Design a protein around this nucleic acid. Structure first.
Ligand SMILES: C[S@@+](CC[C@H](N)C(=O)[O-])C[C@H]1O[C@@H](n2cnc3c(N)ncnc32)[C@H](O)[C@@H]1O
Ligand SMILES: [Zn+2]
Ligand SMILES: [Zn+2]
Ligand SMILES: [Zn+2]
Lengths: 219, 97, 82, 110, 103, 98, 86, 109, 95
DNA sequence: CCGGCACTGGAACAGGATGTATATATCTGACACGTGCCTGGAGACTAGGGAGTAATCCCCTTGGCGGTTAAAACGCGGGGGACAGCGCGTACGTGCGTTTAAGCGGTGCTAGAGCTGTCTACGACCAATTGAGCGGCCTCGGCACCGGGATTCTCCAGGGGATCGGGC
DNA sequence: GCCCGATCCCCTGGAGAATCCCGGTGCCGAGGCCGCTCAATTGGTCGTAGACAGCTCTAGCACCGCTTAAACGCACGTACGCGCTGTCCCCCGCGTTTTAACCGCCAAGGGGATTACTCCCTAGTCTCCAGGCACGTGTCAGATATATACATCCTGTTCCAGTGCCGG
């Protein structure tokens, strides 16, 4: 039984925090052309696919052909909520996705570093055990509390089949989990991650791998 | 102000030759001086080269024939083939009227 | 007032930026002591001639045509200052 | 004089000063005697070579949705035609920047 | 106890391919104006003492020194690639200048 | 076994005899037959003075002999000793002739 | 008009001739495809000079290419040549 | 004339023709009015600059144990001086050969 | 018939005999030193020209032929030739 | 369990055979003078303006001070590109025998470059009258920026119907 | 057997949310309009620079024969390209903290441009005369051609340097 969590499509500030957009005056131009099967595709080279820029639907010379419009077109699988053991509702895919594929984007609540310290020291001490903090930049902290997506709905591991990357679109950063290999359905979905606690460890790393002994705080 | 001395330039001919090619665009104060220096730099080459053609042959006149060879020496392949026609036409148009 | 040491004003990132505008991807650790030796002699072969042209006309101020002429002497023409 | 003054630039059909070119040829110490058809041949060449640059400056200025020329367009206009680039080899234009190019082996490979 | 997660970093060679595409498109100046203006006055105390400059003259040398260095760092790269490398070592600038004719 | 000087020394034994003479090293008639054929495109039925053919041979040889000394530094840069046709182009390109 | 047409006289710059110009320059060992690019480098130097010599001749209304027109055409490209008068 | 001709190149104590350098400046269209201390100053420099390139070619001839100066001696005298090699940078001298030099990496191991 | 052809031969030959008494010089070398002098002459004049024209004057003088030497001759020649010339120009007038 | 009848890798050095200076003769074609004579330098005077020179106004190069925030300096990590070594075989150097144009004496012929005289068309010089061209003044006035009311789209919402565990 | 009091999938009044777009404000940078003055036009006289119809004579192109250096293949074996793998340390990406470039002000004076006046250094014309250019003749400095006298490079035959691996 999932607890009550609010849903939201894209990010949002939560007070003093504010995002910055970008006009079409300095957005980096591509160099491909609307020629073949994959205009600004994945295989065919693209100076924006390489350097971690997501094209804009207008600056492209092809126009309505650049497949590198993902953090906006919102291409996902469905992946109905599955249940795991020892953690919660760890989820299993129901497609046969290839490698280099997109998975849900981590969107939440964006909060100042100083502000974050307060919002965790308020609740943590009252036995809520909040464990959703992921830094993007100094003064940027995406929080998965008040709001969220299918993105908060993830699980740590040590030998995963997906990772956390970092793109930038329209002048602002993004975070999108990707497909590292061609994983079929009937497989658990998880991503390892590195952290740096402010208090102490509370659980030895427990994944189910061969060398996944670890801890919570060590690499 | 003592009504300072005057200064001459190509700033009202560069601007005229613009409107016969692009009847809508404008030009900036900092991209005018570049064309000014451009003309005041391509003038000396074509003058000085004829000033030595007219000396290797023991003469003292700069005719309308030295300028037709200074061009053929200074300008590259396809450029030096239209300027010749421009010149030889704008003098036939002048010698009659 | 006297001066010294001011060649250390061409900092490290100031050379990295001129490099990136050139088109180089990685950079060794000893270019930063070789480029400040290439830049310090190109300047003398120009300031000497600027000072000479100024010394000739009995002035006391390096105007902005002396530099154009000193650079025109060596096939480094400059467009847009006079 | 008696009759009306028809400027010497108008007869030939130019826009450059055929009156002023003559004085500069006469007071520059290039010879002892200057002909009569020299400035008319010299101005009709200084006109063509300015048409040839303003044309390309406009053609490469409208490709950015602007209606005004700035020093960057001049360099982009000249560094791409292989005859103006040869006639203007050792020349440095202020506030011009470089052309866009990266080598072919520095692009990250698969 | 209450920690924070962190995403990956960039594989070496992307914040260096962004700077190229960013700098080959603007037109500003790339050296600090006062530090450059003091070097010019420090050099020129060896030819004639107590001479002044013109605000538009001290900015005439900076538009040439850099168009020189940028054209030299383009011929260093061709040699560094000739030797089957990616890095540019000091023993390339000397070859470039030697062939060109300065030394 | 005709005493077989070890390969790589006869060359070093004439590098130091062609650096002291002053003669010219191309055949006069096969050179003067090339000039009269290149210059047939520009103007028709010319006649060359006899001291304006010997005035081109020096320029041509003093150009090639000074291009090879700049080719022979690239081949050393790349850790070789034999010059190849992918070197001439680098020297010309760096000079600024193409 | 004895202008008996000519064909392929570039192959007169033979192999040992090029090797001698090489040896004078100080090279120890030579590849096998240089003898086809040295000709292509020479036949482009000669034209930029002969064209200018013929232009200097035409302007004077003559028919004999003398030995001062070559000196002028060479001084034109920053390749001054001492020795032959001027 | 009243007195006898006391030529101008002997008042200054030179060797080059002051009477000729002046006319050359005048009939060559370099400027309009030519001064009177110009030819004296220029002929002296022309004399000094040629009073040195021979002083080295002579010293280079006495090493072949000869007496007559030929072109090769001039090239060997010029390519070995750090100032003349900079003033005559782009100039070629007929019949001059090259300057004897060989690399360091090619000598037999 | 064969009008004439002036040169600097009889003066170079006079200069030679002050630095090397017993020495001769062949034709191919006379015909080189000739062009050398006849080349330096025009480089030195053709810049006093442009100096006089920049400063808006009409006369060439010793104050021009000096500044035209510090720009052409590099290094120590520019320090010895200048010392040379201002001896002849001084001695000439005082006569 | 390391050493001993013979046993196998590195080192040394005269000795040969070739190429590179020595000294004698010897001889020839170009270097260094002497001679006449025709230009071009030199010596004196006269007449007109370019540059040395003193005095004046005022533009613009220094000198100093304070606050902001964009950039430079330093130390941790941690993964990727430079330098060393080995092995395999393709390609240029060396020498010898055989085929082909460069090169050196002439000899003939005429095409075109250099000179000389006559003489007509053309650019410098000068005075007079008037229309193009630079300096300054205003105006507009297309371009950046916010109110700003509301317009397709999207929730929060408490409640309208479909539904059940026994209720009677 | 027939029926009821709340209770989960749907439904739209409040709202709400950014946000194409109609519509206020302020620009520093260019764009059109009048006094003002001086370089360009026109009309005439003159004295040369340059075009041209002969005319002599040097030299660049064409032919021929002959003796010999230089280009041309052809076979071999070796010294140098080229491709591949393993160890490693050096140059790149981040987080904190320190500093001095920058924008924007006030204040004092050095020296850069002009301008009116008076002298003295060059352009210029005649006569007058000697330094330098072509011609013609004499003889010696240097280029061959031999004949030695070596100095440089290459390789096979002993001697150290430890010895193959067998053993009792
Ligand atoms: C983000 S929550 C997701 C909960 C549940 N899996 C779901 O889908 O709703 C992940 C939880 O797994 C726990 N976790 C993460 N890594 C773990 C590990 N290595 N061993 C045991 N628990 C772990 C964390 O404490 C955290 O509470
Ligand atoms: Zn693309
Ligand atoms: Zn795109
Ligand atoms: Zn684990």
């Amino acid at each position: 039984k999932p607890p009550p969590y609010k849903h939201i499509k894209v990010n949002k500030p939560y007070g003093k925090v504010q995002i910055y957009t970008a006009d079409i005056s300095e957005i980096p131009k591509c160099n491909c052309k609307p020629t073949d099967e994959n205009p600004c595709g994945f295989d065919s080279e693209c100076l924006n696919r390489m350097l971690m820029f997501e094209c804009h639907p207008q600056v492209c010379p092809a126009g309505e052909f650049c497949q590198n419009q993902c953090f906006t077109k919102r291409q996902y699988p469905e992946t109905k909520i599955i249940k795991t053991d020892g953690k919660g509702w760890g989820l299993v895919a129901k497609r046969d996705i290839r490698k280099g594929e997109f998975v849900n984007e981590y969107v939440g609540e964006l909060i100042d570093k100083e502000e974050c310290m307060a919002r965790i020291k308020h609740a943590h001490e009252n036995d809520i055990t909040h464990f959703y903090m992921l830094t993007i930049d100094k003064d940027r902290i995406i929080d998965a509390g008040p709001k969220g997506n299918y993105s908060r709905f993830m699980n740590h591991s040590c030998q995963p089949n997906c990772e956390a990357l970092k793109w930038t679109v329209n002048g602002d950063t993004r975070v999108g989990l990707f497909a590292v290999c061609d994983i079929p359905a009937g497989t658990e979905l998880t991503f390892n991650y590195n952290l740096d606690c402010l208090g102490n460890e509370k659980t030895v790393c427990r994944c189910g791998a061969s060398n996944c002994s670890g801890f919570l705080g060590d690499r | 102000k003592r009504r300072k001395t005057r200064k001459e330039s190509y700033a009202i001919y560069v601007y005229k030759v613009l409107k016969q090619v692009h009847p809508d665009t404008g030009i900036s104060s900092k991209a005018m001086s570049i064309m000014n220096s451009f003309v005041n730099d391509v003038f000396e080459r074509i003058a000085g080269e004829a000033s030595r053609l007219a000396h290797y042959n023991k003469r003292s006149t700069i005719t309308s024939r030295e300028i037709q060879t200074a061009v053929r020496l200074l300008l590259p392949g396809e450029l030096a083939k239209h300027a010749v026609s421009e010149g030889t036409k704008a003098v036939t148009k002048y010698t009659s009227a | 007032k006297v001066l010294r040491d001011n060649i250390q004003g061409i900092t490290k990132p100031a050379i990295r930026r001129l490099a990136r505008r050139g088109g180089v991807k990685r950079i060794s650790g000893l270019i930063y002591e070789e480029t400040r030796g290439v830049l310090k002699v190109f300047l003398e072969n120009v300031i000497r001639d600027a000072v000479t042209y100024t010394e000739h006309a009995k002035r006391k101020t390096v105007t902005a045509m002396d530099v154009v002429y000193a650079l025109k002497r060596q096939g480094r023409t400059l467009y847009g200052f006079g | 004089t008696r009759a009306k003054a028809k400027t010497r630039s108008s007869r030939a059909g130019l826009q450059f000063p055929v009156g002023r070119v003559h004085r500069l040829l006469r007071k520059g110490n290039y010879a002892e005697r200057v002909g009569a058809g020299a400035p008319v041949y010299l101005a009709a060449v200084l006109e063509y070579l300015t048409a040839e640059i303003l044309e390309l400056a406009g053609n490469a200025a409208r490709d950015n949705k602007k209606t005004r020329i700035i020093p960057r367009h001049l360099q982009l206009a000249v560094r791409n035609d292989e005859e103006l680039n040869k006639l203007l080899g050792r020349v440095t234009i202020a506030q011009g920047g470089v052309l866009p190019n990266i080598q072919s082996v520095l692009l990250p490979k698969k | 106890t209450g920690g924070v997660l962190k995403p990956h970093r960039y594989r070496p060679g992307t914040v260096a391919l962004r700077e190229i595409r960013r700098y080959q498109k603007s037109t500003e100046l790339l050296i600090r104006k006062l530090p450059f203006q003091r070097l010019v006055r420090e050099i020129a105390q060896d030819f004639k003492t107590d001479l002044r400059f013109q605000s538009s003259a001290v900015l005439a040398l900076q538009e040439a020194s850099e168009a020189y260095l940028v054209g030299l760092f383009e011929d260093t790269n061709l040699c560094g690639i000739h030797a089957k490398r990616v890095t540019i070592l000091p023993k390339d600038i000397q070859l470039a200048r030697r062939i060109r004719g300065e030394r």
